[PDB]
Amino acid sequence: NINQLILRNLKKNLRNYYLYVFALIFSVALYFAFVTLQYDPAINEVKASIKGAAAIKTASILLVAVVAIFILYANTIFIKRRSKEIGLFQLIGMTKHKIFRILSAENVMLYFGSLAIGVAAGFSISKLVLMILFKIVDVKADAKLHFSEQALVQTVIVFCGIYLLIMIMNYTFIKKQSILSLFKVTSSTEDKVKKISFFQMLIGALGIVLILTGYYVSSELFGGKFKTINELFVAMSFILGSVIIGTFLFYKGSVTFISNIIRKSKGGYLNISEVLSLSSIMFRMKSNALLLTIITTVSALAIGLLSLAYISYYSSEKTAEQNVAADFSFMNEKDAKLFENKLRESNISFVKKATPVLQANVDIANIMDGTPKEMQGDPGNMQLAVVSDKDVKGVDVAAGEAVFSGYTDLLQKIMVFKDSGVIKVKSKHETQPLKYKGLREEFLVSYTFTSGGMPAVIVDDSLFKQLDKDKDPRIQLAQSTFIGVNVKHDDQMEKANELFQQVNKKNEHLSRLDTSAAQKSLFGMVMFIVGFLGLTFLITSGCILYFKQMGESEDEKPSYTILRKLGFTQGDLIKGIRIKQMYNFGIPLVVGLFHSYFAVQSGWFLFGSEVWAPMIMVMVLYTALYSIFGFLSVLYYKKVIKSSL
Amino acid sequence: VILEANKIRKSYGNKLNKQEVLKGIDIHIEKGEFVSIMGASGSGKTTLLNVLSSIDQVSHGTIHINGNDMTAMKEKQLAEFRKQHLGFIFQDYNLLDTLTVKENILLPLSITKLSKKEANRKFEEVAKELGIYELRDKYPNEISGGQKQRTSAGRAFIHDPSIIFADQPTGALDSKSASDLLNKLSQLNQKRNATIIMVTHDPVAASYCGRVIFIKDGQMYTQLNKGGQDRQTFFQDIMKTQGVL
Amino acid sequence: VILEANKIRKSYGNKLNKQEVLKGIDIHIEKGEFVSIMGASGSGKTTLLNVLSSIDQVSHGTIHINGNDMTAMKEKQLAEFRKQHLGFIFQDYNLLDTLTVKENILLPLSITKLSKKEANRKFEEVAKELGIYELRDKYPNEISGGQKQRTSAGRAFIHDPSIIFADQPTGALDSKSASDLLNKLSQLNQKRNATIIMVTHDPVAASYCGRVIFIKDGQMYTQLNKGGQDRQTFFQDIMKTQGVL
Numbered sequence A: 001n002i003n004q005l006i007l008r009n010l011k012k013n014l015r016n017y018y019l020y021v022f023a024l025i026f027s028v029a030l031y032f033a034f035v036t037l038q039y040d041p042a043i044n045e046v047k048a049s050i051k052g053a054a055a056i057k058t059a060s061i062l063l064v065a066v067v068a069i070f071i072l073y074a075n076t077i078f079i080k081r082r083s084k085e086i087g088l089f090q091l092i093g094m095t096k097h098k099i100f101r102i103l104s105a106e107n108v109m110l111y112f113g114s115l116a117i118g119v120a121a122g123f124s125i126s127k128l129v130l131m132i133l134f135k136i137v138d139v140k141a142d143a144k145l146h147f148s149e150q151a152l153v154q155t156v157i158v159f160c161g162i163y164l165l166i167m168i169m170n171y172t173f174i175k176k177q178s179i180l181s182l183f184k185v186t187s188s189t190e191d192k193v194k195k196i197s198f199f200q201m202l203i204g205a206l207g208i209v210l211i212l213t214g215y216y217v218s219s220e221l222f223g224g225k226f227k228t229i230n231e232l233f234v235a236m237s238f239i240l241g242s243v244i245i246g247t248f249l250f251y252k253g254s255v256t257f258i259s260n261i262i263r264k265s266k267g268g269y270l271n272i273s274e275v276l277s278l279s280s281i282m283f284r285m286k287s288n289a290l291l292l293t294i295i296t297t298v299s300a301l302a303i304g305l306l307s308l309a310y311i312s313y314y315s316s317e318k319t320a321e322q323n324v325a326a327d328f329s330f331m332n333e334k335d336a337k338l339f340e341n342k343l344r345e346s347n348i349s350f351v352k353k354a355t356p357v358l359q360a361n362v363d364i365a366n367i368m369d370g371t372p373k374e375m376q377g378d379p380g381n382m383q384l385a386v387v388s389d390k391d392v393k394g395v396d397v398a399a400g401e402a403v404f405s406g407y408t409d410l411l412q413k414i415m416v417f418k419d420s421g422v423i424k425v426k427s428k429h430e431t432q433p434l435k436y437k438g439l440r441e442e443f444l445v446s447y448t449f450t451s452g453g454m455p456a457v458i459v460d461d462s463l464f465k466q467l468d469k470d471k472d473p474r475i476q477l478a479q480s481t482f483i484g485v486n487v488k489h490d491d492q493m494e495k496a497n498e499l500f501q502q503v504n505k506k507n508e509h510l511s512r513l514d515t516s517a518a519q520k521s522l523f524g525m526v527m528f529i530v531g532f533l534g535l536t537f538l539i540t541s542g543c544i545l546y547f548k549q550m551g552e553s554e555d556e557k558p559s560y561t562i563l564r565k566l567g568f569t570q571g572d573l574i575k576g577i578r579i580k581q582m583y584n585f586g587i588p589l590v591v592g593l594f595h596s597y598f599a600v601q602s603g604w605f606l607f608g609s610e611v612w613a614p615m616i617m618v619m620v621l622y623t624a625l626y627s628i629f630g631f632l633s634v635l636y637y638k639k640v641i642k643s644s645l
Numbered sequence B, C: 001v002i003l004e005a006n007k008i009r010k011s012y013g014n015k016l017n018k019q020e021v022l023k024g025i026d027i028h029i030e031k032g033e034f035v036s037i038m039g040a041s042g043s044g045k046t047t048l049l050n051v052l053s054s055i056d057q058v059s060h061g062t063i064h065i066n067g068n069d070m071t072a073m074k075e076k077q078l079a080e081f082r083k084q085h086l087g088f089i090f091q092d093y094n095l096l097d098t099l100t101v102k103e104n105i106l107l108p109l110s111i112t113k114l115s116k117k118e119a120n121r122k123f124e125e126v127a128k129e130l131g132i133y134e135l136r137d138k139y140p141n142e143i144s145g146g147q148k149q150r151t152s153a154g155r156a157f158i159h160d161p162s163i164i165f166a167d168q169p170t171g172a173l174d175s176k177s178a179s180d181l182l183n184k185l186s187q188l189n190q191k192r193n194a195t196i197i198m199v200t201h202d203p204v205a206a207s208y209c210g211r212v213i214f215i216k217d218g219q220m221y222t223q224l225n226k227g228g229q230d231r232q233t234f235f236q237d238i239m240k241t242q243g244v245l
């Protein structure tokens, strides 16, 4: 009649059983979504290649390892939570084998029910994220997610293989216990050293060294000795293993040292501001040295993927704006006259600016801080564009001075510019030297006049008065004109663009929105995959943060009804938990930010052409969300305390 | 007088069954009196202590302590008052599993201003007064079943209380240790004016007292006074009265 | 004879800080006996009960129960012995908070092959002559401190055991309930031959026995064999011996 007793116990212990099926649900909801993304006909173009296929080989093992570790930790907590019925049954007369069989049967039922439930949860999340990305971000990918049939087999095989590990852990826990230790394991400390134990400092040092060497290897991944598809996979595996192992060894060996050096230096007086902040973490340091690692890893992954997606989007938009150098651009004067005449009856005014250009070659070899290996043309024969001083409304350079323009952040990685020097201008039969002043922050010519991509130069009008007179006719284009069109604040720009398209029959004139659309469409899959994965990992991070809150709130409830009995007010207990919350929400966030910063910096210049503008902007929002979650956690603890007595 | 009670009433229920445990208890404890309560095993005694203090609530009645009354008193001043006085000795051995013996003893002393050396010396004196020494670095799991009682008893003697509430102090102690604890309680009552209320079942412990109150089914049944009598005669009277009941 | 110990030794520690709580204890209980152990408060009594049973392992020495040894014994026959004999009472009142009184008492009957009526009848009888019968739909968290003791004691007679190990049964009960429990234990000792071992601090409760062993610092110290004497004379002898110690 054991079954009736177990069901009767379940009818009352419903809180512990609701924190296990939840983990078993969202782990599957994550893994199935990742697999169904991986198996999709539209991704075969991204497949093969050299770099693209290596990512799939390492993600496929990373997600498996993460899910297995999390599920095993949750099961260990679930078993250790009761640990009393087992001892009572052992005293009553059951052998160990019968207890093992009962536990295994219950685990089979619960685990397979949760596996069946979880699959229907991942599909909805995947479709919802797809709807968000296709609707309120407005990207073009032309990809669809279907239910498929290999995904179910891939999920079921792995989640049936995990059951063997779970059963092994349960059996070894049952075997390696005494009939008396089970009674007092629920209220037994885990800090088993109670000393200084300088060995923990050594462990922390090894963790830091491993993290640093992982960072250093990651800094030299692309553009080096890795060329074969069997070489990038090994490097990625080594980096992603070293970082996690280093973080885990850093957390375990550091908290147990600075948390002992504080208590031992007090002798033990412990007013009520530390009994709720230091004693708790000393009680449960060993079980929190593994959850914090998971939180940091998932947060770092989410931040990195979102940062890369935003880099792609922002760089596409900025490059589209950059290639035209103005709102509207024209090649010849007559079509510009047509467009302006058409706008004349459109009740829209235009700012027409004319800037002559003199294409000439100069020497910037001395100011370059790079290497001759990066040729990018003859070292003494960069082709530039020269404009006067009156054409600029922002600066007025003096005589015998040279100023450059343009920023194009990616350019400051191959061509590296030094401080002020001397620039040699070579002409037909004269040599006028100039000396560098600074680099501006704007582009003055379209991509036709910039040749390979180097920006233009601004000189004083006095020198231009004879530079234009000389006008060496050997590298000049068909005509020297940069007639452009500028408009006011946000208005019916689409109407003007439609007029532009209906003007150019041969479509030989540049536009802004068309280039933006082309650039956005050319990177659709690349900006879609990372966004999808980042959003899924963000949701999983939120769920895993919420789970720990309820677990730890329920674990230590009886301690709030003893201190409140002796006389301490409910307004003083809340002053000791803020420290714990600040610690728990300040360590992982900082470590994850460091990981994300050293992760994005080694993988850009494949997704876009700008880093420091979007990367800073994407971390602030995540920090704000994380702080909001922490504030909600503190409010929930306040509500729990109020009802303790 | 200090503690004044008038037609108290308590009831434990869930809006469906309302069982009654106390029906009209009246007490008039005075300053410096070693009043003891005993009787039966199913009536309300620990509930009587809980309602008498501020640790619990009441249904019908009024209680006066040191003049002021707890009718409109909030949960802030009440907690402050319970912190500044009213040392407690619980029955279920209310210790903290995340601390040590020394921390548990010294925690209530850490409210106002006490310094490290003074606190250490005071704990030293109290610890070797009772007998819990060389157990200053052991969690309340590795400790025996009577040393927990001694620690809980010693927690309430360290911050100089004005009123002491006892709940079976001699529950898991032999004759000698119980005699030592009772003698310390009597000395604390005598040398310094501090009322002590103790609830126990063993007549020997109640012999040390000054008054004995018998409770049966939530009612006042008989009340001795001792007075100008020796300990032996009082103990014999307690035994005879218990035999009558 | 049933129990036969030879130089029992136990040590609490972790191979670096090892203490000693038992040093050469010899017990020779014979079938149909009522033995009691009393003395001190920090010495080894609960550990003695835990080691004479099959719950904790002996560091050095051998113990024989019913002829065959038990320290070096396989798991299957040991579990069979647990199921068909034994029965133990915990000082900490080891109950299950997620059940109520009825299942917590009927738990030992959940493995044997009995119907729905016989188990209920046996529980009703035990509750009838134990005192706690109206407490059947109440969880062991809204129950007093003595009724929990009665529940723990009652979850040992429901499967007709042959050896009953008691650990301070009368610690939170008045005189009437203690007398009821002791006379019930005596009645189960005479009709159904079953050795009983009990540890207590109250001389009145221990007067019901037939032999007492005093333990001081984990060593044997005298042994009163009682014999053909009245209860009052035995009580006086126990009191005198305790006073000498």
Ligand SMILES: CC(C)=CCC/C(C)=C/CC/C(C)=C/CC/C(C)=C/CC/C(C)=C/CC/C(C)=C\CC/C(C)=C\CC/C(C)=C/CC/C(C)=C/COP(=O)(O)O[C@@H]1OC[C@H](N)[C@H](O)[C@H]1O
Residues within 6 Å of the ligand: A046, A049, A050, A051, A052, A053, A055, A056, A058, A059, A214, A215, A218, A236, A239, A240, A243, A297, A300, A301, A304, A305, A526, A529, A530, A533, A595, A596, A598, A599, A600, A602, A603, A606, A607
């Ligand atoms: C590949 C893909 C589908 C998606 C990319 C993202 C992804 C899911 C990758 C799988 C792998 C994953 C999940 C990577 C994690 C990444 C992060 C940020 C982890 C933080 C947490 C954390 C714990 C970090 C600590 C570790 C540290 C400090 C560093 C690790 C550095 C690392 C290994 C990767 C980061 C850089 C990237 C993203 C390169 C992606 C490279 C790639 C092929 C993109 C395809 O770009 P594509 O435009 O196709 O490239 C064209 O391809 C056609 C042409 N012929 C050329 O090959 C080419 O020009």
Ligand SMILES: Nc1ncnc2c1ncn2[C@@H]1O[C@H](COP(=O)(O)OP(=O)(O)OP(=O)(O)O)[C@@H](O)[C@H]1O
Residues within 6 Å of the ligand: B141, B142, B143, B144, B145, B146, B147, B172, C012, C013, C021, C040, C041, C042, C043, C044, C045, C046, C047, C048, C091
């Ligand atoms: N888990 C433990 N680890 C180490 N020492 C322990 C542990 N449990 C108890 N002790 C110590 O070993 C001895 C055994 O104490 P024990 O429980 O036998 O005392 P007792 O006199 O039977 O108890 P009580 O009279 O309080 O019911 C005591 O000195 C105790 O402090």
Ligand SMILES: Nc1ncnc2c1ncn2[C@@H]1O[C@H](COP(=O)(O)OP(=O)(O)OP(=O)(O)O)[C@@H](O)[C@H]1O
Residues within 6 Å of the ligand: B012, B013, B021, B040, B041, B042, B043, B044, B045, B046, B047, B048, C141, C142, C143, C144, C145, C146, C147, C172, C173
């Ligand atoms: N939380 C509760 N909810 C409901 N009924 C309760 C609760 N606590 C106690 N009772 C019951 O109400 C009465 C109050 O018992 P109380 O705790 O006052 O006993 P006691 O005098 O401490 O007993 P003893 O020391 O003999 O165990 C008892 O009948 C008890 O079963």
